[PDB]
Structures are given as C-alpha cells and as structure tokens.
Design a protein around this nucleic acid. Structure first.
Length: 138
DNA sequence: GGTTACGGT
C-alpha cells in the first residue's frame, strides 16, 4: 500500500507519491530530496536562515533524502528533475548516523523486490493531496 | 556503497 511521508518509519519497505525538491548527482549515486508536504519527526529540520542555499522550501521537517544506487542511479540521473512528481514503490527506509530518516534504492539485478521510481504527470489526481497541502506552505 | 541539509557539479 501507499504511505504518506508522515507515516513512514525506519527499516521498512514503503511506497509513496512525492514531489522532487532537489537532485544531486555524483560519480557514486544519484540523490533526490522529496516531499509530500506532510511532516515526519525523523526528517531534517530544513532552515530558512541558511546563507546562500538554493533550497526554497519546504522548511522544517518536511522532506526526505533518497539515495539511488546502480540501475536506479543510471536511470534517474538524467531523467528525474527538480519539480517533477514521482511515485516510488517498494523502496527501503533507514536511519542515518545522525538519526534522520533516509530512503534507499539498492541495486536489485535479481529483481527480488519489485522496486521502481517513475514520473507522474502533474495532472494525475493521485497528486491532488500533495498540491492541496503545498498551498498551506506557500 | 556514501555523508550530513550544502554544493548547484
């Protein structure tokens, strides 16, 4: 089933709709920061006071970092863009060394876990709640 | 498999 981001907990498999806020590519992986405009106590409290950040919101504990490895990296790195909506299915969660939630997509060549990430056209009704909540923070 | 809310590649 699908969860809101406020509902996810560490060390589980989950699926959710979200909007991509930030992407970062490296030679090791591809990173997404995603939000569905619901709060989670385990998310990093994003500060509006940072000098010179390119982040424009949401602020506080409203976004989660996703680390994409292997085929997930190679597929998304020149495809998923900031602002895109995505549906992420059967991804894994963890807690990092500092105690924050993170989402991980490990390579799965064996096709054991049926993981996926795909773009969702902005017009899809599955995104209505994300859009209605975003209005609260603009 | 990586480190820390940036950097803006």
């Amino acid at each position: 089933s699908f969860s809101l981001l406020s509902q996810i907990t560490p060390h589980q498999r989950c699926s959710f709709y979200a909007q991509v806020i930030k992407t970062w590519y490296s030679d090791k992986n591809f990173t997404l920061y995603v939000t569905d405009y619901t709060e989670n106590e385990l998310f990093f409290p994003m500060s509006p006071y940072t000098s010179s950040s390119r982040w424009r919101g949401p602020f506080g504990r409203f976004s989660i970092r996703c680390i994409l490895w292997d085929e997930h990296d190679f597929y998304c790195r020149n495809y998923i863009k900031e602002g895109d909506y995505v549906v992420m299915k059967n991804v894994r969660t963890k807690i990092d060394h500092l105690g924050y939630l993170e989402c991980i997509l490990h390579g799965d060549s064996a096709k054991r876990y049926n993981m996926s990430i795909e773009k969702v056209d902005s017009e899809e009704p599955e995104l209505n709640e994300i859009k209605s909540r975003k209005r609260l923070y603009v």
